[PDB]
RNA sequence: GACGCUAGCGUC
RNA sequence: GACGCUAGCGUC
């Protein structure tokens, strides 16, 4: 199935957000769409950003919750946005519908509706 | 079908799938002599125990500018046999030429004999 | 060897 | 971020 889940911090199981906010870029990188999501992150510059292909590592992103700070990926200015970047193995992938929680550690293997990035959202 | 394993490094011929046999359906091992030559072995630097055999020697290629790390020697029951992995190896399917590349053992599917202890 | 983990480095 | 490579540590 392809239907809607919700990413939970692996460290907390604090909601994230869910898989219809995800957007992809380069059909490789993750991104969340909406203000709210913004809530749930906070960021620290990046000790050694480096630059490649059409964007550019800013910082790294925590879980807000003070007793986690779990490392959640990275902030990235593409193209004249300024955009988080996530990394699926810093969370648990939970049904919406049974509970059912999934470990993954990379992208090319969760096989949900990825729907891609669109500039006018 | 029947496989060669090449070395990943300089493709020199190893041993046949044919030859391959599995001990607790997780450690590959390779009966006769002539896979004995195809390899030279070396005091393990952190030898150890687990399971039923002791780790007693990190095994390389020979042929000396590749000695490529094909896995280690080990006791087990009454015999000392070569453990490889699979990581260190091309495998070429003899028909085609088509070379495989795995990384681990529970990818590469072919009739997975096991060990028998009657057999050398 | 079979797996896991930490650190560092390299490319777009 | 996506891969890739080293080194070390742990378990059986
Ligand atoms: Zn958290
Ligand atoms: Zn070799």
């Given at each position: 199935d392809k239907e809607n889940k919700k990413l939970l911090?692996?460290?907390?199981?604090a909601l994230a957000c869910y898989t219809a906010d995800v957007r992809v870029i380069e059909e490789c990188h993750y991104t969340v769409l909406g203000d709210?999501?913004?809530?749930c992150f906070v960021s620290r510059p990046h000790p050694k950003p480096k630059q490649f292909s059409s964007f550019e590592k800013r910082a790294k992103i925590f879980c807000a919750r003070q007793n986690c700070s779990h490392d959640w990926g990275i902030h990235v200015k593409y193209k004249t946005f300024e955009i988080p970047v996530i990394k699926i193995e810093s969370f648990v992938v939970e049904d919406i519908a049974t509970g059912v929680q999934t470990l993954y550690?990379?992208?090319?293997?969760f096989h949900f509706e990825k729907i891609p990035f669109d500039p006018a959202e």
């Open positions: 911090c692996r460290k907390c199981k709210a999501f913004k809530e550690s990379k992208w090319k293997d």
